[PDB]
């Protein structure tokens, strides 16, 4: 659904905590307005995983929806003595940041959100490793997503889950083995997933499955004024209670009572939504987030 991709799940907040000048169009992201922290993900040719799960949450959305927590320092200062907490973790990542960006966020190895930031008139370099002075007219108001990922809510416990990769000694900042032969190093696009009580879990394989449903989270409701989001909680179910009156597709009318003259809004079933599960070492689990990132991998020969 092309324009309904801006009808976000949850609150739809796509702002970073320290940059609130875009709140009019990022808090929340909806049909109207532009958002420097969100529109990046919908450019065709970029972020293929999120674009195939676009009705799920972004990293910023998962943070403001209490699904993902912030790092103990929520943002690292590149132009300091060290920029330490993110520096060692950012250098193993091969990233590309567009111009005029003051902040860039990523999923930590701890399953939390870290941010890389710069002074008010610096741009992030093309590798997101240094702060370069601004050669635009003005900076963007938001933060650039470094990884291609989507997120969801989950109570499935993954405290027993850990990275298992064939013949891999070091992937990113994770050392899996003691390798004393001399090794093969390369930048590999490695999938990963975060679980409730786990760290980041890299995988040889991305095996995902979706169970679609007719729960309220799988619907996009909207009204014409010119599109405006509508919350399905105001719609009465079949034999139910409603503060407003709605209509919709055959999927919505199968569970909610439909009225195709009076309607305040229209609800469509967001195809592609639902609960996503991933296979980790031969076991299906409900992850908090799933994504890719190009990072340094050392494999034994």
């Amino acid at each position, epitope marked *: 659904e092309d324009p309904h991709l801006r009808n976000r799940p949850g*609150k739809g*907040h796509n702002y970073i905590d320290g940059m*609130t*000048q875009e*709140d*009019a169009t990022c*808090k*929340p992201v909806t049909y109207a307005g532009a958002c420097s922290s969100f529109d990046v993900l919908l450019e065709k040719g970029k972020f293929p995983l999120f674009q195939s799960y676009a009705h799920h949450r972004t990293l910023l959305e998962a943070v403001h929806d209490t699904i993902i927590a912030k790092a103990d320092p929520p943002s690292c200062d590149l132009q300091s003595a060290h920029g330490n907490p993110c520096m060692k973790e950012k250098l193993v990542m091969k990233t590309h940041c567009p111009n005029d960006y003051q902040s860039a966020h990523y999923l930590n190895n701890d399953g939390k959100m870290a941010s890389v930031k710069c*002074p*008010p*008139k610096y741009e992030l370099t093309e590798d997101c490793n240094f702060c370069r002075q601004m050669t635009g*007219a*003005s*900076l963007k*108001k938001g933060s650039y997503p470094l990884q291609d990922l989507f997120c969801q809510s989950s109570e499935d416990d993954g405290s027993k889950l850990k990275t298992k990769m064939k013949g891999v000694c070091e992937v990113g900042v994770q050392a899996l083995k003691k390798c004393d032969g001399q090794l093969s190093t390369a930048h590999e696009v490695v999938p990963f997933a975060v679980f409730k009580n786990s760290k980041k879990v890299y995988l040889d394989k991305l095996d995902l499955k979706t169970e679609e449903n007719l729960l309220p989270d799988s619907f996009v409701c909207f009204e014409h004024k010119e599109l405006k989001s509508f919350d399905i909680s105001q719609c009465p179910k079949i034999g139910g209670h409603g503060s407003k009156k709605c209509t919709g597709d055959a999927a919505f009318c199968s569970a909610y009572e439909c009225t195709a003259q009076y309607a305040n809004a229209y609800c469509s079933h967001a195809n592609g939504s639902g609960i996503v599960q991933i296979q980790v070492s031969g076991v299906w689990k409900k992850p908090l987030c799933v994504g890719y990132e190009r990072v340094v991998v050392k494999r034994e020969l």
Partner: antibody, heavy 121, light 115 residues
């Protein structure tokens, strides 16, 4: 088009509380983030607090923290602002206000007409 | 953060008035949207326009294009420019920035169109 109407002028003894209203018409209150700004006579504007509806959290300024309380009546589209432990320096015109950037579609009111509150015994 | 505006400013009719809004040294004008309000006695403040950049800016409803905004990075100032000054423009003018959970207003500037 939004219409913001505040209650009438007030006189309160020092130490008591004052309660100001802002009635919203032409728009639904539960889609607006209402703020409050006061202005002592002949002086500048001062932000007192606001309610973030996207967050559902009420924020206050520290100069008033403990004294200013913000409620609402969704059935009447009316927001309320309560200031306690009134002192002589609290004499001001109290405005209910709306973010002009987020609500650039509105061609009606962004501020209330104002409510004068005099503190005297 | 304190926003300092000159207490008063004056210009002749037909000329251009330039009102400044200087920010402290620990924050930058380049980071924030800059609100500008016009307030006349007996009435609430009226939103003039906001300026962040030449591509991120907006004008208030019913506000003539004589009112425009800009920034000066070297002086760390937000600027409200009123071209073709007319008699009805004599009022108080406030600037506002929204960096965190607070509306921070400048001291206000009494602009007198020099009768």
């Amino acid at each position: 088009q939004v219409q913001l109407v505040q209650s009438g002028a007030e006189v309160k003894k020092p130490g008591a509380s004052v309660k100001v209203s802002c009635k919203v018409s032409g728009y639904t209150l539960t889609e607006l983030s209402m703020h409050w700004v006061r202005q002592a006579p002949g002086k500048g504007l001062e932000w007192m607090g606001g309610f973030d509806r996207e967050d559902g959290e009420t924020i206050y300024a520290q100069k008033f923290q403990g004294r200013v309380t913000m409620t609402e009546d969704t059935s009447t589209d009316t927001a309320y602002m309560e200031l306690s432990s009134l002192r002589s320096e609290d004499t001001a015109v109290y405005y209910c206000a709306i973010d002009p950037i987020r609500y650039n579609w509105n061609y009606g009111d962004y501020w209330g007409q104002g409510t004068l509150v005099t503190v005297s015994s | 953060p304190v926003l300092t505006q000159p207490p008063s400013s004056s210009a002749s009719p037909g000329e251009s008035a330039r009102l400044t809004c200087t920010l402290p040294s620990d924050i930058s004008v380049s980071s924030y949207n800059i609100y500008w309000y016009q307030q006349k006695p007996g009435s609430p403040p009226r939103f003039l326009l906001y300026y962040y950049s030449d591509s991120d800016k907006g004008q208030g409803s019913g506000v003539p294009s004589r009112f425009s905004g800009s920034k000066d990075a070297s002086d760390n100032t937000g600027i409200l420019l009123i071209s073709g000054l007319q008699s009805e423009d004599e009022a108080d003018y406030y600037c506002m920035i929204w960096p965190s959970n607070a509306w921070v207003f400048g001291g206000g500037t009494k602009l007198t169109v020099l009768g």
